[PDB]
Write a protein that binds this ligand. Structure first.
Ligand SMILES: CC(=O)N[C@H]1/C(=N/OC(=O)Nc2ccccc2)O[C@H](CO)[C@@H](O)[C@@H]1O
Length: 435
């Protein structure tokens, strides 16, 4: 099923929420993505930091409009409070439109993430700068820097309107919008946030958040509705979706594509990919086997170091989804992810490209071949062959025909077929003999 494999999405994810990436850096990543046979760039722009500003950032919520220039000041400041990156603060609308167009012309899509209700430090800060009160979730006196309180109607309304503003921009120029949903209050609860949101149902009268997880389902579904209204497919990370396999709080919108990144860990019991598929969700395999955190560049340098990610790529194929329960889990594609958890780390293009190249090579039948050198070779053939001998001319014409007769849907596994055809053309041109 070569055609089914090549039809899958192959995606590189870049955390440009925590850390600034310039348009030039992002274009270079797009170029490499295209070369290695990827289909999409997944660009987080809201992920702790918020690093994408529309021309009009005015937000209507809470019975008022927050002025564009105030929302911009609030977000720039709020992002800087998370991390004031010396390289830059945000991409502009003009830059994003140009980047999406640049990618489109190369056959690469762009999938944005603007994360909530977790990983939203900068939006929380921005809301406080606008004057919204107490937006942050707290757990027995420990305030999350990252997560909104779903009981705070003003904070929730603002956040939804902000997501809507971005989704309206991305409408018609993208296909999928990642609303995130990972790791609720991971700081304040020591990575127990879903358990906390579920706890009051089963452990009442203990001070746990009343209707916490029910409100989360409603929030996720309302963001899904917002995204869908703009003709975009919503996507979200898996960990909070039917956490603890618990279907008793409500149901998630089936139109949410699941980015399946984790199988969970000790005391963090996530729904299996089997359960999620059976509930009607499509799955993008985002296995954290393949993760790379910038600056963790070799064995021993911490979790998700480059050597660990390269090992994960070698040992966990694109078809291996987290927590399958032994079931056959279909996928829409696979996504290798680079993250900026320590955003002051130096971004190394060569290390990212090595990760990308290894993912492509390890799953070569899924990745598109590279035809650009073949097209260049054709452009370099002498146009007029009259002055050469008939025998030598025929050989060039046959070699050109052979290139133009290559299957246009070859995989990276078949690159040598293309490269051999290029070499043969070059040989025949070199052998052109003047009459
Ligand atoms: C969806 C996702 O990956 N969320 C976070 C994320 N979550 O990963 C974990 O929490 N992983 C983990 C948890 C417990 C034990 C081992 C790994 O990993 C990335 C790399 O650190 C972070 O940049 C992301 O923000």
């Amino acid at each position: 099923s070569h055609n089914e494999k090549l039809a899958k999405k192959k995606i590189v994810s870049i955390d440009a929420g925590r850390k600034y990436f310039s348009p030039e850096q992002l274009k270079e990543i797009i170029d490499k993505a295209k070369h290695y046979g990827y289909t999409d760039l997944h660009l987080l722009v809201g992920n702790d930091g918020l690093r994408f500003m529309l021309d009009d950032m005015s937000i209507t919520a809470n019975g008022k409009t927050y002025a564009s220039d105030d929302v911009k000041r609030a977000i720039e400041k709020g992002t800087n409070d998370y991390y004031n990156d010396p390289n830059g603060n945000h991409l502009t609308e003009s830059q994003m439109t140009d980047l999406i167009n640049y990618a489109k012309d190369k056959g690469i899509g762009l999938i944005p993430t603007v994360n909530s209700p977790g990983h939203m430090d900068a939006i929380l800060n921005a809301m406080k700068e606008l004057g919204i009160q107490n937006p942050n979730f707290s757990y027995f006196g420990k305030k999350s820097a990252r997560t909104v309180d779903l009981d705070n109607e003003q904070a929730v309304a603002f956040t939804k309107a902000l997501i809507d503003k971005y989704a309206a921009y991305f409408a018609k120029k993208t296909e999928i919008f990642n609303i995130g949903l990972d790791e609720y209050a991971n700081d304040a609860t020591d990575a127990k946030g879903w358990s906390v949101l579920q706890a009051d149902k089963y452990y009442p009268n203990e001070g746990y958040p009343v209707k916490g997880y029910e409100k989360f389902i409603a929030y996720a579904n309302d963001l899904a509705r917002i995204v869908k209204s703009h003709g975009l497919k919503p996507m979200a990370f898996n960990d909070g979706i039917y956490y603890n396999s618990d279907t008793s709080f409500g149901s998630f919108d089936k139109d949410i594509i699941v980015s399946m990144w984790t199988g969970g860990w000790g005391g963090y019991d996530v729904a299996s990919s089997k359960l999620l598929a059976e509930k009607g969700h499509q799955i993008l395999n985002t296995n954290d086997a393949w993760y790379y955190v910038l600056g963790r560049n070799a064995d021993g340098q911490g979790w998700y170091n480059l050597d660990q990610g390269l090992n994960g790529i070698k040992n966990t194929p694109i078809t291996s989804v987290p927590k399958t329960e032994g079931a056959d889990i279909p996928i829409i594609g696979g996504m290798v992810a680079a993250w900026a958890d320590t955003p002051s780390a130096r971004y190394s293009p060569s290390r990212l490209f090595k990760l990308m190249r290894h993912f492509a090579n390890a799953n070569a039948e899924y990745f598109a071949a590279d035809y650009e050198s073949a097209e260049q070779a054709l452009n370099e053939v002498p146009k007029d062959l009259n002055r050469y001998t008939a025998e030598s001319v025929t050989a060039v014409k046959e070699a050109e025909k052979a290139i133009r007769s290559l299957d246009s849907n070859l995989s990276r596994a078949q690159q040598d077929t293309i490269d051999q055809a290029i070499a043969k053309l070059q040989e025949t041109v070199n052998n052109l003999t003047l009459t």
